[PDB]
Design a binder for these strands. Structure first.
Ligand code: ZN
Lengths: 39, 53, 53, 39
DNA sequence: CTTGGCTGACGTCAGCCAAG
DNA sequence: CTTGGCTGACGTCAGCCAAG
């Protein structure tokens, strides 16, 4: 891994923003999930 | 010129420590976030599995 | 007795650094584990949501 | 948080073992999930 | 190939907080 | 209340690796 801490913090924050983006998008569709699941 | 050659090193050590501690705080923050995300995902999985029963 | 009073401090600094680096490696390991767990859970959620379609 | 690193490592490893336990238990029941979901 | 940014290790000094 | 374990900060020295 890169030595300079700016690059380590950059990696951690970028990965965290990406995983949080995918997680937020995934959690947006549970309402329609439970609605279409009952019909 | 050796005196300034040690002065710039002294100054660089400070910013290196700052970036070190900041980086560790970033890691711990990321761990907490990932823990909350994990707990939420696991709970939603339990809910959707109970949805079939 | 001050000489040994500095010797024990010198020795303690080494073990303190060892525990420091070891602790950081532990944190990073935990982050990687939590990342893999998150990706797997999210993929399974996507699969179960596609199961209703 | 506790100062001594032994306690920090102890906390991280204990929490990690607990979350990995719950995660492993949760992932054990996807086969019966997809089997009972089709019937 | 050679400076310089930057970061590991060391040692020393305050200083904390619990164990005595 | 007072030692001692232990850990933050500092400063110095090697040393790396890319920028010059
Ligand atoms: Zn340090």
């Amino acid at each position: 891994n890169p030595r300079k801490f700016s690059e380590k913090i950059a990696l951690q924050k970028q990965r965290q923003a990406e995983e949080t983006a995918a997680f937020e998008e995934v959690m947006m569709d549970i309402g329609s999930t439970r609605l279409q699941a009952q019909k | 010129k050796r005196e300034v050659r040690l002065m710039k090193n002294r100054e660089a050590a400070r910013e290196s420590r700052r970036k070190k501690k900041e980086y560790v705080k970033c890691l711990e923050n990321r761990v907490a976030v990932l823990e909350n995300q994990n707990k939420t995902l696991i709970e939603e999985l339990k809910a959707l599995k109970d949805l079939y029963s």
